[PDB]
């Protein structure tokens, strides 16, 4: 299906930006699931900590 000389490269580029940008969203998602790991850890560590004082 005949096309001009530059259209096939505009169509390949408009799906490079999309995969790059959808690649960044993934990186940031994974980071925010690491915050909920730090948070949980902290809480349970403060509980185990108080126990050791009171029983002493």
């Amino acid at each position: 299906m005949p096309v001009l000389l530059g259209i096939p490269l505009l169509l390949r580029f408009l799906g490079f930006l999309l995969v790059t940008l959808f690649g960044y969203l993934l990186t940031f998602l994974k980071k925010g699931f690491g915050k909920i790991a730090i948070a949980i850890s902290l809480f349970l560590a403060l509980i185990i900590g108080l126990n050791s004082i009171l029983v002493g």
């Binding site: 299906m1 005949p2 096309v3 001009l4 000389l5 259209i7 096939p8 169509l11 390949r12 799906g15 999309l18 995969v19 959808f22 690649g23 969203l25 993934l26 998602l29 994974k30 699931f33 909920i36």
Partner: protein
Amino acid sequence: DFDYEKMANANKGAMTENADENALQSDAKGKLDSVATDYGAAIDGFIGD
């Protein structure tokens, strides 16, 4: 006796490519459908922890 309609069909052939619609549409998906399986996998693995 310039063949008006032979020069035209010779300007075209030199300033035109060839493109398969259903091949530029299968690659695009192919690459965006690999990043969507890692976004799902992530979500699924947080609700199982």
